[PDB]
Coordinates of all heavy atoms in Angstrom, one line a residue:
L49 N 68.3 -31.2 15.1 CA 67.2 -30.2 15.3 C 67.0 -29.9 16.8 O 66.1 -29.1 17.1 CB 66.0 -30.8 14.7 CG 65.9 -30.8 13.2 CD1 64.9 -31.7 12.6 CD2 65.6 -29.3 12.7
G50 N 67.8 -30.5 17.7 CA 67.6 -30.2 19.1 C 67.5 -28.8 19.5 O 66.5 -28.3 20.1
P51 N 68.5 -28.0 19.2 CA 68.6 -26.6 19.6 C 67.3 -25.8 19.2 O 66.8 -25.1 20.0 CB 69.8 -26.0 18.9 CG 70.7 -27.2 18.6 CD 69.8 -28.4 18.5
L52 N 66.8 -26.1 18.0 CA 65.5 -25.5 17.6 C 64.4 -26.0 18.4 O 63.5 -25.3 18.7 CB 65.3 -25.7 16.1 CG 66.2 -24.9 15.2 CD1 66.1 -25.3 13.7 CD2 65.8 -23.4 15.4
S53 N 64.4 -27.3 18.8 CA 63.4 -27.8 19.6 C 63.3 -27.2 20.9 O 62.4 -26.5 21.3 CB 63.5 -29.4 19.8 OG 62.3 -29.9 20.2
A54 N 64.4 -27.3 21.7 CA 64.6 -26.6 22.9 C 64.1 -25.1 22.9 O 63.1 -24.8 23.5 CB 66.1 -26.6 23.3
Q55 N 64.7 -24.3 22.0 CA 64.4 -22.9 21.9 C 62.9 -22.7 21.8 O 62.4 -21.7 22.4 CB 65.1 -22.3 20.7 CG 64.7 -20.9 20.4 CD 65.7 -20.2 19.5 OE1 66.8 -20.7 19.2 NE2 65.3 -19.0 19.0
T56 N 62.1 -23.6 21.1 CA 60.7 -23.4 20.9 C 59.9 -24.3 21.8 O 58.7 -24.2 21.9 CB 60.3 -23.7 19.5 OG1 60.7 -25.1 19.2 CG2 60.9 -22.7 18.5
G57 N 60.5 -25.3 22.5 CA 59.7 -26.2 23.3 C 58.8 -27.1 22.5 O 57.8 -27.5 22.9
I58 N 59.2 -27.3 21.2 CA 58.4 -28.2 20.3 C 59.2 -29.4 20.0 O 60.3 -29.3 19.4 CB 57.9 -27.5 19.1 CG1 57.1 -26.2 19.5 CG2 57.1 -28.4 18.2 CD1 56.8 -25.3 18.3
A59 N 58.8 -30.6 20.4 CA 59.6 -31.8 20.2 C 59.7 -32.0 18.7 O 58.8 -31.7 17.9 CB 59.0 -33.0 20.9
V60 N 60.8 -32.5 18.3 CA 61.1 -32.8 16.9 C 59.9 -33.6 16.3 O 59.3 -33.2 15.3 CB 62.4 -33.4 16.7 CG1 62.6 -33.8 15.2 CG2 63.6 -32.5 17.1
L61 N 59.6 -34.7 17.0 CA 58.5 -35.5 16.4 C 57.1 -34.8 16.5 O 56.2 -35.2 15.7 CB 58.5 -36.9 17.1 CG 59.6 -37.8 16.8 CD1 59.5 -39.1 17.7 CD2 59.7 -38.1 15.4
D62 N 56.9 -33.8 17.3 CA 55.7 -33.1 17.2 C 55.7 -32.2 15.9 O 54.7 -32.1 15.2 CB 55.5 -32.2 18.4 CG 55.1 -33.0 19.7 OD1 54.8 -34.2 19.6 OD2 55.0 -32.3 20.8
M63 N 56.9 -31.6 15.6 CA 56.9 -30.9 14.3 C 56.8 -31.8 13.1 O 56.2 -31.4 12.1 CB 58.2 -30.1 14.2 CG 58.2 -29.0 13.1 SD 57.0 -27.7 13.4 CE 58.0 -26.6 14.3
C64 N 57.3 -33.0 13.2 CA 57.0 -34.0 12.2 C 55.6 -34.3 12.0 O 55.1 -34.4 10.9 CB 57.8 -35.3 12.5 SG 59.5 -35.2 12.3
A65 N 54.8 -34.3 13.1 CA 53.4 -34.5 13.0 C 52.7 -33.3 12.3 O 51.8 -33.5 11.5 CB 52.8 -34.7 14.4
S66 N 53.2 -32.1 12.6 CA 52.7 -30.9 11.8 C 53.0 -31.1 10.4 O 52.1 -30.9 9.5 CB 53.3 -29.6 12.4 OG 53.0 -29.5 13.7
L67 N 54.2 -31.4 10.0 CA 54.6 -31.5 8.6 C 53.8 -32.7 7.9 O 53.3 -32.5 6.8 CB 56.1 -31.8 8.4 CG 56.6 -32.1 7.0 CD1 56.2 -31.0 6.0 CD2 58.2 -32.2 7.1
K68 N 53.6 -33.8 8.6 CA 52.8 -34.8 8.0 C 51.4 -34.3 7.7 O 50.8 -34.5 6.7 CB 52.7 -36.0 9.0 CG 52.0 -37.2 8.4 CD 51.6 -38.2 9.5 CE 52.8 -38.8 10.2 NZ 52.4 -39.9 11.1
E69 N 50.8 -33.5 8.6 CA 49.5 -32.9 8.4 C 49.5 -32.0 7.2 O 48.6 -32.0 6.4 CB 49.0 -32.2 9.6 CG 47.5 -31.6 9.5 CD 46.9 -31.0 10.8 OE1 47.7 -30.6 11.7 OE2 45.7 -30.9 10.8
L70 N 50.5 -31.1 7.1 CA 50.7 -30.3 5.9 C 50.8 -31.0 4.6 O 50.2 -30.6 3.6 CB 51.9 -29.4 6.1 CG 51.7 -28.2 7.0 CD1 53.1 -27.6 7.3 CD2 50.8 -27.2 6.4
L71 N 51.5 -32.1 4.6 CA 51.7 -32.9 3.4 C 50.3 -33.5 2.9 O 50.0 -33.5 1.7 CB 52.7 -34.1 3.6 CG 54.1 -33.7 3.8 CD1 54.9 -35.0 3.9 CD2 54.6 -32.8 2.8
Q72 N 49.6 -34.0 3.9 CA 48.4 -34.7 3.5 C 47.2 -33.8 3.2 O 46.4 -34.1 2.3 CB 48.0 -35.7 4.7 CG 49.1 -36.7 5.0 CD 48.8 -37.7 6.1 OE1 48.2 -37.3 7.2 NE2 49.1 -38.9 5.9
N73 N 47.1 -32.7 3.9 CA 46.0 -31.8 3.7 C 46.3 -30.6 2.7 O 45.5 -30.1 2.0 CB 45.5 -31.2 5.0 CG 45.1 -32.2 6.0 OD1 45.0 -33.4 5.7 ND2 45.0 -31.8 7.3
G74 N 47.6 -30.1 2.8 CA 48.0 -28.9 2.1 C 47.9 -27.7 3.0 O 47.8 -27.8 4.2
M75 N 48.1 -26.6 2.4 CA 48.1 -25.3 3.1 C 46.7 -24.6 3.0 O 46.5 -23.6 3.7 CB 49.2 -24.4 2.6 CG 50.5 -24.9 3.2 SD 52.0 -24.4 2.3 CE 52.0 -22.6 2.6
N76 N 45.8 -25.1 2.2 CA 44.4 -24.6 2.1 C 44.4 -23.1 1.9 O 43.6 -22.4 2.4 CB 43.7 -25.0 3.4
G77 N 45.4 -22.7 1.0 CA 45.5 -21.2 0.7 C 46.4 -20.5 1.7 O 47.1 -19.5 1.3
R78 N 46.5 -20.9 2.9 CA 47.4 -20.3 3.9 C 48.8 -20.2 3.4 O 49.2 -20.8 2.3 CB 47.4 -21.0 5.2
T79 N 49.7 -19.5 4.0 CA 51.1 -19.4 3.7 C 51.9 -19.4 4.9 O 51.4 -19.2 6.0 CB 51.4 -18.1 2.9 OG1 51.5 -17.0 3.8 CG2 50.3 -17.8 1.9
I80 N 53.2 -19.7 4.8 CA 54.2 -19.8 5.9 C 55.4 -18.9 5.5 O 56.0 -19.1 4.4 CB 54.7 -21.2 6.2 CG1 53.5 -22.1 6.4 CG2 55.6 -21.2 7.4 CD1 53.9 -23.5 6.9
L81 N 55.8 -18.0 6.4 CA 56.8 -17.0 6.1 C 56.8 -16.4 4.7 O 57.8 -16.2 4.1 CB 58.2 -17.6 6.4 CG 58.4 -18.1 7.8 CD1 59.8 -18.8 8.0 CD2 58.4 -16.9 8.7
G82 N 55.5 -16.2 4.2 CA 55.3 -15.6 2.9 C 55.1 -16.7 1.8 O 54.5 -16.4 0.8

């Protein structure tokens, strides 16, 4: 996942923290890429 991290400046484990939050709370109606 490095190249994607670099390109966005988002550390892999920071995106893991985002996903963890999504798993536990849900999307609350929101959507991602449709």
Side-chain angles (χ1 to χ4, degrees), residues 49-75 77 79-82:
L49 284 162
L52 287 172
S53 197
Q55 173 162 352
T56 57
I58 303 174
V60 175
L61 290 176
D62 288 354
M63 195 65 87
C64 287
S66 298
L67 176 50
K68 188 195 297 186
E69 186 175 19
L70 282 167
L71 293 183
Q72 302 181 316
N73 305 346
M75 282 157 69
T79 80
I80 309 185
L81 296 175

